[PDB]
Amino acid sequence: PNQALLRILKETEFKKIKVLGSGAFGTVYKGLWIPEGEKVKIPVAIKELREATSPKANKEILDEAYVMASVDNPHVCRLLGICLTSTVQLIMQLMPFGCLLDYVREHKDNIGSQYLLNWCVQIAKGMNYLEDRRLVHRDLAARNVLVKTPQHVKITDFGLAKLVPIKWMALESILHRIYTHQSDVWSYGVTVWELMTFGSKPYDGIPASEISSILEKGERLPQPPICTIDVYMIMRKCWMIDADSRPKFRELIIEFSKMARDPQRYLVIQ
Ligand SMILES: *CCC(=O)N1CCC(Oc2cc3c(Nc4ccc(Cl)c(Cl)c4F)ncnc3cc2OC)CC1
């Protein structure tokens, strides 16, 4: 473990400025990092996890935090600092444009095929890096991809589950609680479907308990109108029951990179 990669922050070093979101996990804020002895105010995001009733020990938390601090890839968010008190507070660079799911929903009219394909490439690059580190994300979804700038996105919330999204999970994860890189590939396929539909809800209106029976019967998310069969076939391959028959993230990089070269060929957008 490279301890230098992770800053242990003092409560005086950072300030919460505004609420960005809240959920069962806790609260996420926009704030400022003001390291002592420096002349800079750094915009950051601060995530405060809900106070644990039987928390993991501080040693265990730091061990996971070191892993999150060691991620070095342009398409995966890195843990910048941590503050451990009654709660766990995580500090990361601010991604000013928010989650990609909100972004595609707000910009449905103005999003072209090259943007969409470039995002697919960047997401697969991030996931491939995590696989290279032998790390399983387990919660990839459009809501967990953040927009640093419109053409630079990063996968977030890695390791947060350690420290249930049935509609993004591979069948084996639902039935047997098995999570692997190939189950991440299934989630990747759903994430791409979210983007191609400009933020539609997958299996809209269907209860979580019914999803597995839908998947067992061979039903899958429908082909988005803008996707050519070439793009849809890739998405469908991510949803095969046999996990090893799904594409590899390394393969997804190559395919979407090729399509990104001729976007109008692979996406038909008004
Ligand atoms: C859009 C889906 C949704 O409702 N939300 C996701 C984005 C949230 O707004 C922003 C969050 C961040 C984060 N989040 C974050 C994730 C992991 C970790 Cl460890 C940490 Cl410390 C985080 F802060 N990170 C960076 N920038 C942003 C920016 C956001 O909006 C500008 C709201 C809920």
From Swiss-Prot:
Phosphorylated on Tyr residues in response to EGF. Dephosphorylation by PTPRJ prevents endocytosis and stabilizes the receptor at the plasma membrane. Dephosphorylated by PTPN1 and PTPN2. It is found in: Cell membrane; Endoplasmic reticulum membrane; Golgi apparatus membrane; Nucleus membrane. Ubiquitously expressed. Isoform 2 is also expressed in ovarian cancers. Coiled coil: none annotated. Changing S70I: Found in a lung cancer sample; constitutively activated kinase with higher levels of basal autophosphorylation; more sensitive to gefitinib than wild-type. ATP binds at L20, G21, S22, G23, A24, F25, G26, T27, V28, K47, M92, Q93, D157. Changing L140V: Found in a lung cancer sample; more sensitive to gefitinib than wild-type. The modification N6-(2-hydroxyisobutyryl)lysine is found at K47. Residues 14-267 form the Protein kinase domain. There is a cross-link at K18, K39, K56, K59, K217, K248, K258 (Glycyl lysine isopeptide (Lys-Gly) (interchain with G-Cter in ubiquitin)). Changing D262A: Strongly reduced phosphorylation. Changing I8A: Abolishes phosphorylation. The active site is at D139 (proton acceptor). Changing L6A: Abolishes phosphorylation. It comes from the Eukaryota. Binding of the ligand triggers homo- and/or heterodimerization of the receptor triggering its autophosphorylation. Heterodimer with ERBB2. Forms a complex with CCDC88A/GIV (via SH2-like regions) and GNAI3 which leads to enhanced EGFR signaling and triggering of cell migration; binding to CCDC88A requires autophosphorylation of the EGFR C-terminal region, and ligand stimulation is required for recruitment of GNAI3 to the complex. Interacts with ERRFI1; inhibits dimerization of the kinase domain and autophosphorylation. Part of a complex with ERBB2 and either PIK3C2A or PIK3C2B. Receptor tyrosine kinase binding ligands of the EGF family and activating several signaling cascades to convert extracellular cues into appropriate cellular responses. Known ligands include EGF, TGFA/TGF-alpha, AREG, epigen/EPGN, BTC/betacellulin, epiregulin/EREG and HBEGF/heparin-binding EGF. Ligand binding triggers receptor homo- and/or heterodimerization and autophosphorylation on key cytoplasmic residues. The phosphorylated receptor recruits adapter proteins like GRB2 which in turn activates complex downstream signaling cascades. This is Epidermal growth factor receptor. The gene is EGFR.
